[PDB]
Amino acid sequence: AVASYDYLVIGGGSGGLESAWRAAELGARAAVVESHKLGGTCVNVGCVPKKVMWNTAVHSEFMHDHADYGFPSCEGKFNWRVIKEKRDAYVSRLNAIYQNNLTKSHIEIIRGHAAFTSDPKPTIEVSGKKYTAPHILIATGGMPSTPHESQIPGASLGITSDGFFQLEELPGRSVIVGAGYIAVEMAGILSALGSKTSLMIRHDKVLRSFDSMISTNCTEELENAGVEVLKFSQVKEVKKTLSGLEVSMVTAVPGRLPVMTMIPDVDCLLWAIGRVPNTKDLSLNKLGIQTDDKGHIIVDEFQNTNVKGIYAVGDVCGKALLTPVAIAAGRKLAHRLFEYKEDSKLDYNNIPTVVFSHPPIGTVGLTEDEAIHKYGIENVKTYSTSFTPMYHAVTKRKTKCVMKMVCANKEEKVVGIHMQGLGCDEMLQGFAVAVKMGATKADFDNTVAIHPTSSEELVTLR
Amino acid sequence: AVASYDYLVIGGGSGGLESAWRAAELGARAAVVESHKLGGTCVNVGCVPKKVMWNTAVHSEFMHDHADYGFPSCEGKFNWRVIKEKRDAYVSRLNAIYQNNLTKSHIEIIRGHAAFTSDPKPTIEVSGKKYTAPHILIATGGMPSTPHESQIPGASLGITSDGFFQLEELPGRSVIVGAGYIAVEMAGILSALGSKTSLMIRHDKVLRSFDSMISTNCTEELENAGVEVLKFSQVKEVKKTLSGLEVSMVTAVPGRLPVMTMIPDVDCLLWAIGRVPNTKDLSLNKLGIQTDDKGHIIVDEFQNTNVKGIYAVGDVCGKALLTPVAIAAGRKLAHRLFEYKEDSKLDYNNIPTVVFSHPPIGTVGLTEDEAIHKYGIENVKTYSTSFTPMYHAVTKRKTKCVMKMVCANKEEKVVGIHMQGLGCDEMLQGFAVAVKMGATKADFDNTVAIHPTSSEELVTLR
Numbered sequence: 001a002v003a004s005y006d007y008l009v010i011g012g013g014s015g016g017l018e019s020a021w022r023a024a025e026l027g028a029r030a031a032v033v034e035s036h037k038l039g040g041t042c043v044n045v046g047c048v049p050k051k052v053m054w055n056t057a058v059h060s061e062f063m064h065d066h067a068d069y070g071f072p073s074c075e076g077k078f079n080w081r082v083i084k085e086k087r088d089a090y091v092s093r094l095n096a097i098y099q100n101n102l103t104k105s106h107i108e109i110i111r112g113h114a115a116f117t118s119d120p121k122p123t124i125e126v127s128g129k130k131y132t133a134p135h136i137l138i139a140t141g142g143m144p145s146t147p148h149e150s151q152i153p154g155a156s157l158g159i160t161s162d163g164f165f166q167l168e169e170l171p172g173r174s175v176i177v178g179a180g181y182i183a184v185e186m187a188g189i190l191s192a193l194g195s196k197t198s199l200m201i202r203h204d205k206v207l208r209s210f211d212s213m214i215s216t217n218c219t220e221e222l223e224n225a226g227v228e229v230l231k232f233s234q235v236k237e238v239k240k241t242l243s244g245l246e247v248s249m250v251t252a253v254p255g256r257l258p259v260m261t262m263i264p265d266v267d268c269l270l271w272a273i274g275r276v277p278n279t280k281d282l283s284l285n286k287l288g289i290q291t292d293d294k295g296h297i298i299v300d301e302f303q304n305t306n307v308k309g310i311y312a313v314g315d316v317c318g319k320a321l322l323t324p325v326a327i328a329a330g331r332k333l334a335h336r337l338f339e340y341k342e343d344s345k346l347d348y349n350n351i352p353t354v355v356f357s358h359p360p361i362g363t364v365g366l367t368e369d370e371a372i373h374k375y376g377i378e379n380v381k382t383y384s385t386s387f388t389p390m391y392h393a394v395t396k397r398k399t400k401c402v403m404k405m406v407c408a409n410k411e412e413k414v415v416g417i418h419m420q421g422l423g424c425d426e427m428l429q430g431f432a433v434a435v436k437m438g439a440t441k442a443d444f445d446n447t448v449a450i451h452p453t454s455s456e457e458l459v460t461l462r
Numbered sequence: 463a464v465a466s467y468d469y470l471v472i473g474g475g476s477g478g479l480e481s482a483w484r485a486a487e488l489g490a491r492a493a494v495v496e497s498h499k500l501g502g503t504c505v506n507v508g509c510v511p512k513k514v515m516w517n518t519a520v521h522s523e524f525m526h527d528h529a530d531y532g533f534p535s536c537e538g539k540f541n542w543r544v545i546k547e548k549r550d551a552y553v554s555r556l557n558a559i560y561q562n563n564l565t566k567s568h569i570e571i572i573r574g575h576a577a578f579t580s581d582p583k584p585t586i587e588v589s590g591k592k593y594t595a596p597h598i599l600i601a602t603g604g605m606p607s608t609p610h611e612s613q614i615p616g617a618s619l620g621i622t623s624d625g626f627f628q629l630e631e632l633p634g635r636s637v638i639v640g641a642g643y644i645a646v647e648m649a650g651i652l653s654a655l656g657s658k659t660s661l662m663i664r665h666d667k668v669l670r671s672f673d674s675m676i677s678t679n680c681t682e683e684l685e686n687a688g689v690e691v692l693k694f695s696q697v698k699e700v701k702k703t704l705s706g707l708e709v710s711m712v713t714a715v716p717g718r719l720p721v722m723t724m725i726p727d728v729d730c731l732l733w734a735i736g737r738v739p740n741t742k743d744l745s746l747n748k749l750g751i752q753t754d755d756k757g758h759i760i761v762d763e764f765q766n767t768n769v770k771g772i773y774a775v776g777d778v779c780g781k782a783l784l785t786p787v788a789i790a791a792g793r794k795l796a797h798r799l800f801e802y803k804e805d806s807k808l809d810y811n812n813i814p815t816v817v818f819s820h821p822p823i824g825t826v827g828l829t830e831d832e833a834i835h836k837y838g839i840e841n842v843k844t845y846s847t848s849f850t851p852m853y854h855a856v857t858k859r860k861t862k863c864v865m866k867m868v869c870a871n872k873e874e875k876v877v878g879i880h881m882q883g884l885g886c887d888e889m890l891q892g893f894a895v896a897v898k899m900g901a902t903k904a905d906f907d908n909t910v911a912i913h914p915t916s917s918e919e920l921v922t923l924r
């Protein structure tokens with residue numbers, strides 16, 4: 001029967017747990033329905049297991065500069081199993097920590113699958129057991145999208161990021177299909193570690209929604225790293241040969257004639273084409289809750305759905321798909337609800353983001369074209385530099401560091417910082433803080449530099 | 463005879479060159495007297511050659527986590543020569559670049575040693591040739607201090623940072639004497655690379671002028687890295703045995719009786735006790751230019767000496783001894799002089815600094831005690847965290863990451879950020895920009911985090 005609480009959170013991922021923590025910490029009676037493992041996508045099959053795999057690739061990369069630094073080289077041969085077993089243990093330790101905090105904060109964990117009922121007042125049922133609350137948050141997140149046989153015959157022969165983390169040996173030949181961050185990172189980890197990789201993109205470059213400098217630089221650094229970027233190409237079908245897979249792909253460079261080619265002996269085919277929300281089995285239809293054509297839950301600036309007492313945050317909304325954003329919104333909400341801060345909402349402007357490619361990308365703000373459109377070419381001035389990290393001053397293998405700064409108006413307010421280079425992963429957080437206080441280039445320029453670093457380049461751009 | 467210019471800069475180091483560049487770029491007729499190699503301390507025997515040696519040590523460190531990441535280990539044996547020859551070539555390329563820019567900007571380079579004359583109007587002479595200008599800047603910098611036989615007999619048997627960069631093989635047994643940044647860095651590079659090292663400090667910990675957390679953490683990380691910290695100890699004398707050196711050191715832990723011990727078979731004895739200014743051979747006495755008891759040139763908030771038309775910037779003044787500060791002040795000055803910005807002066811508050819120890823230290827602002835004294839215990843709240851970088855979640859060897867944030871007053875204005883951990887070298891510049899705009903913790907806290915990174919810890923401190 002309906003057990004009542006002050007807050008019912010559906011899904012124990014990033015947004016979910018943060019909302020429940022802050023909420024209870026403000027005196028509420030929360031419970032967290034979760035059908036699988038706490039932590040959600042991020043911890044089990046995302047941010048965490050990705051970062052470890054990346055570090056591993058970073059080790060692979062630098063093995064290349066060993067002799068250069070005076071040390072003897074190493075015979076090579078990465079063992080995937082060893083690092084996988086560990087990566088996995090780590091994730092378990094994290095899970096144990098998560099349950100611990102939840103219980104330590106007195107938050108129930110209704111285990112199982114939640115779905116709204118055919119009751120007048122918002123109510124959900126988990127195993128014939130119904131629970132209701134004056135405030136219910138849907139934080140079910142999303143999932144990897146795979147193409148159906150109904151369009152790409154043999155599409156179901158390939159894997160997704162989820163099956164990537166399930167992989168137990170280093171694939172011989174990998175084919176990534178997708179041109180966004182997840183694709184790029186998978187492309188780069190797999191390649192660094194030894195697999196022959198082809199990244200299949202429908203256009204000429206990657207991370208197309210990122211500033212032109214970033215997508216342009218990133219496509220190059222990828223190519224220079226041993227990755228094959230198959231431009232203007234898609235898969236028509238996949239067949240399970242005896243050797244491996246046979247990717248029949250259509251490559252149609254605009255201005256030429258289309259040309260089909262088979263990719264044989266493929267060990268792995270990763271679909272990194274998108275993320276579809278987790279909303280169908282919630283019975284959103286039972287309450288007449290608004291979704292878009294793609295299943296995402298439509299919410300307002302304050303995470304409100306169209307139904308009173310029901311909110312949604314994170315991936316499931318289809319906006320700014322990142323652990324920190326789900327957390328930031330789940331937190332702002334618990335405060336708005338249980339602390340009565342009517343204006344407690346997350347600002348989706350100037351959200352910082354790091355893409356763990358090689359070298360790592362960092363970005364916060366408007367791309368130059370996003371500024372030119374919002375301000376006008378007369379009001380947008382960019383500053384940029386392209387240099388080689390001194391780490392490479394003694395190595396044969398090189399990478400670059402390109403940093404761009406989009407300034408707007410007379411005072412030259414920094415509206416966008418984009419870079420890619422070594423250390424760009426830890427370099428970003430602070431400038432992201434500065435970009436949020438409304439810093440102008442002079443604020444950056446009246447900051448005594450730190451020498452010798454790559455960061456100082458941003459405060460001496462001229 | 464006296465050739466006249468608009469600006470005469472004495473010394474082509476960090477402060478010197480920046481002042482001349484900006485100056486000429488503003489239409490002046492500059493010349494740069496330099497008795498040695500352009501770039502000064504930093505480029506030839508400082509920032510640059512240090513950073514390369516550090517990167518090298520960082521490679522050594524991570525060689526330790528190779529098998530952990532699934533790769534086979536390496537037999538070891540670093541070759542110093544290889545990396546030294548390279549480090550050196552690099553520095554040459556830099557020198558060539560420096561002359562190039564100077565000439566490209568039409569700045570003369572009077573080669574030789576400058577010294578003021580016995581002329582009424584400020585005039586200097588370089589090789590019986592006299593040159594004068596309405597504005598003369600002394601940017602001679604400083605030099606390593608060594609103890610004289612007159613106190614420490616055999617003191618002249620050891621070397622300094624300068625002789626460190628002259629070293630051609632990896633010393634077998636090194637003894638660093640000094641408890642400040644240069645000492646620590648030399649201690650850590652030499653140790654990472656394979657030398658048995660002892661850091662001799664007159665107290666219990668290092669970097670004593672840094673926030674207590676930093677000096678405390680740093681002394682530990684050093685000890686945990688294979689470095690021997692000889693606390694409460696000094697050298698009484700050094701003798702050249704046949705094997706190597708014999709350091710007779712007095713160790714006097716307060717609360718015990720003093721105990722002398724010999725350190726035998728020492729390959730290297732590095733004096734990292736201090737930096738004395740380059741002012742004696744300038745003939746400062748000829749114009750009655752004010753110096754302090756230690757030879758430093760006394761200047762005001764605007765770099766003015768007590769003599770009209772003569773200024774001083776950088777190490778030679780004995781304040782905030784860093785390349786970026788000399789640059790920042792030489793630049794502010796050229797603008798004040800040639801652009802008539804009467805208030806163009808450098809703010810020595812919130813100068814950021816990175817110490818390249820292992821892991822790297824970063825700091826900007828007031829130490830907690832500097833705030834408690836300036837504000838009062840009732841008005842100072844600190845926040846801190848101590849965690850292990852996830853890079854170590856799979857390694858046996860660990861390091862920590864400790865970050866402290868000193869907040870002041872009701873709004874909790876961030877007056878000091880101190881940390882030590884991996885990536886703390888590139889992490890600092892941005893927070894340094896934020897700390898200068900007068901950011902409050904809420905500004906930091908209303909900054910969507912970047913996950914998974916070490917930096918995010920600073921914007922989620924609670």
Ligand SMILES: Cc1cc2nc3c(=O)[nH]c(=O)nc-3n(C[C@H](O)[C@H](O)[C@H](O)COP(=O)(O)OP(=O)(O)OC[C@H]3O[C@@H](n4cnc5c(N)ncnc54)[C@H](O)[C@@H]3O)c2cc1C
Binds near residue numbers: 036278322914
């Ligand atoms: C590869 C890969 C790498 C990523 N890397 C990063 C990165 O480095 N940085 C970053 O910031 N973001 C990263 N992301 C994005 C980040 O993972 C997501 O933004 C974050 O997971 C979003 O959280 P959420 O709260 O919306 O959902 P989720 O964490 O997905 O959580 C939803 C939880 O609810 C459960 N559930 C679903 N429906 C129900 C229901 N009906 N009843 C009960 N329980 C239910 C789910 O099992 C799940 O555990 C990555 C994603 C992938 C895939």
Ligand SMILES: Cc1cc2nc3c(=O)[nH]c(=O)nc-3n(C[C@H](O)[C@H](O)[C@H](O)COP(=O)(O)OP(=O)(O)OC[C@H]3O[C@@H](n4cnc5c(N)ncnc54)[C@H](O)[C@@H]3O)c2cc1C
Binds near residue numbers: 452500644740744
């Ligand atoms: C080891 C080591 C590491 C360092 N590392 C760093 C670091 O990583 N980061 C950092 O920011 N700072 C570092 N420093 C500090 C930085 O090097 C100095 O702050 C910077 O060099 C200061 O510049 P300056 O303009 O005062 O002098 P300098 O660069 O020393 O230059 C003075 C120049 O003037 C010449 N000269 C002197 N007297 C005369 C005269 N009478 N006539 C003609 N020419 C003359 C000198 O030859 C010299 O080249 C380091 C120092 C050492 C030693």
